Amino acid sequence: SLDSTFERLSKLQPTATSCLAKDSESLFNDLCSVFLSAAVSESDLERFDATPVLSRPKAPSNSFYLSFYLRVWCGPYPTLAKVAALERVKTRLKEGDCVDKDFQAIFPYCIAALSDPAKKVRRAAADLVAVLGSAYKQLWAAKDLYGKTGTTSPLDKDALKALIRSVLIPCLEESVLHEDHVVAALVGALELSHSARLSIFKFLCGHVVETPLLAVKLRLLRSLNQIRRISGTTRTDLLLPLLRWWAGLSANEAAELAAQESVDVPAIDDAVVDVVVPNHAAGLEAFFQLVKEAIRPGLLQAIFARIAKMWPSMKSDTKYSTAKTLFELTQDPKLNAEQSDVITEAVEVLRKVDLTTDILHYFIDS
Amino acid sequence: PSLDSTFERLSKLQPTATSCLAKDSESLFNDLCSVFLSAAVSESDLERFDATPVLSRPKAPSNSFYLSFYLRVWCGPYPTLAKVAALERVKTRLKEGDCVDKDFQAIFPYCIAALSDPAKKVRRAAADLVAVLGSALWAAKDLYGKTGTTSPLDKDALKALIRSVLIPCLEESVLHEDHVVAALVGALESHSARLSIFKFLCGHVVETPLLAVKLRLLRSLNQIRRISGTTRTDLLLPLLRWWAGLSANEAAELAAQESVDVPAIDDAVVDVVVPNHAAGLEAFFQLVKEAIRPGLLQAIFARIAKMWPSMKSDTKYSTAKTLFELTQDPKLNAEQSDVITEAVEVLRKVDLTTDILHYFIDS
């Protein structure tokens, strides 16, 4: 109409559950449908922004208002709406009531938005990071942003000033220029402070585990995954439950979440499996456990292929151990009865890899 | 008197028909050769010697001794002037219409071997001799004792060797020590005279006692897997068998005698076997199961390795099964043989197939 729908939304109940949370799913789509039509007019854009369920005067108290737009960018929605959303939050956070709460939990989504292909979106997330950075020079949605939990390992003060001032703000311009430059920049940052790399690292990783946005997981992972270790803690040591969650869900379940965000299941499989580092005993065990349990085939494939890629940098003795398991796996009575593809995939690992003298003696002696 | 004492001592020695490229006439050859190396520097002593009655000019070709002596001297660890002297003595001895009735083709291997010589003087002297041999069967069953030229060249095949490959690349081979082997390879790579030349060359390589000539000729023969249905392996296998038969003593000794290296031989002998040769690879496995010199062992396995990528699809499986079979052999395991270790080195170095791996697992 579009005011008839605007009035339908007028009589709507404000809430505190975030949009990045389970309970508010049915609400979000409804609002989001309207936003996709309202965002073409600055007039209707304000109409929408203003209806009381969004609760502009309740962000930062509420965690609803910002969460809605976070989710609208980083979502399978056309460019002008991702821009519009980034702007609604950009201008809304300059208002003054907002200089007492922290809002660090937005940076994952800005970081994500800077990997976006649309030039206008990268510039919009750039501007938004600038405003977020001017702020300090406590925590918004600290435990409610995804419903049950929020920002799991918060960012330290020195780590925050290092995130903004050392890694985030200096790379904005080239990040607007090169759709790829963000992952490169963020990796080259966490590989400027010694313990700030660690706190930024943990912070990013936790948000990657906890969001429902597969898209955010991927974009953050394009960079986060290409970091083997930082001061005694491996990225696997931080992200392994992401792998256990993703592996556990059915083919339906994965196809369905992926469809909802219009992302490709294989890309997720690859990204999830890339969480495990070479000489990580527990990550390897998780791999072997997960393949013994019934799982999506593309995931099975992705896991074994990862074991292969991991093989060259596997140390000598864990190489032997991985061959022992692969062998025993070929020899397992239950999988043999199933004639599962686990056998064939395992033998393919044993082909494609460069074996060692010791492994060969294992093969000979039984 | 330059050499009168020695020449009178050689006078009293009785000529024989057992050839120099044969077994028994060893100390005799050594003796004659020692004197020759000193006699070859003076034309006076060269002629005194050439004439000595035990050499038995002009009884060659009645007697296979005279020509075999100088043959053995080109292809020996002897100074340049002595090899040239021998090449010249045979050229001169053979332009003499005394010999226009016998066929001296059994000399061509030794010329070919001689044109690979580094010293240019030797190369051109062998050039002279190839041309003189070209203007025109000697020792056919005698040159090496029990056998001679085991597979000879027909009329068309011999004229093909002379006019087609030898004499046209002759001058460039005198300039370049390399152009000989190259010329012969690019020659066997006419038909099917190629095959008769091939058999002929190989027969002399198997049969000669001159490891140096075996090598020099193999530098070429080994560069040819097959031509018109016959594998070089099928022709050279008894060489491999003989050579594997030798003790470390005998190989080091024979090698010393000609001043060639046991390893270079190990290499050339083993490359005799082409990849997809059932009987040759089978021979390898038999030989390694028997006692052999380690250098040969290393070389045999090293060869199986190199041969692997060209092993046919199924033959990879069968031979990997065989290698495995060796590693599990209890008698060798008690010996803690180096065969086991070299086999596992093969099974490591090689790209396996799913079928081979399943063989390993179901083991």
Residue numbers in the entry:
A (entry chain B): 17 to 153, 160 to 213, 228 to 402
B (entry chain A): 16 to 151, 161 to 213, 229 to 402
What does the article say, verbatim?
The EM densities were docked with the available crystal structures of yeast 40S ribosome and AFs or homology models of AFs. Utp10 is a large protein (1769 residues) with mostly α-helices by prediction. In the EM map, the M domain is continued by an elongated density that should correspond to the C-terminal region (C domain) of Utp10. In addition, the UTPA protein Utp10 adopts an extended superhelical structure pointing upwards, forming the large arch. The WD domain of Utp5 contacts the WD domain of Utp4 and the M domain of Utp10. The exposed H1 lies over the tandem WD domains of Utp17 and contacts the CTD of Utp9 by its base and the M domain of Utp10 by its tip.
The 5' region of pre-rRNA that consists of the 5' external transcribed spacer (5' ETS), 18S rRNA and the internal transcribed spacer 1 (ITS1) is co-transcriptionally packed into a terminal ball of ~40 nm in size. These particles represent the earliest assembly intermediates of 40S and are known as the 90S pre-ribosome or the SSU processome. Within 90S, the pre-rRNA is cleaved at sites A0 and A1 in the 5' ETS and site A2 in the ITS1, yielding a 20S pre-rRNA intermediate. The fully assembled 90S contains an unprocessed pre-18S rRNA, U3 snoRNA, approximately 51 assembly factors and 18 r-proteins with a molecular mass of 5.0 megadaltons.
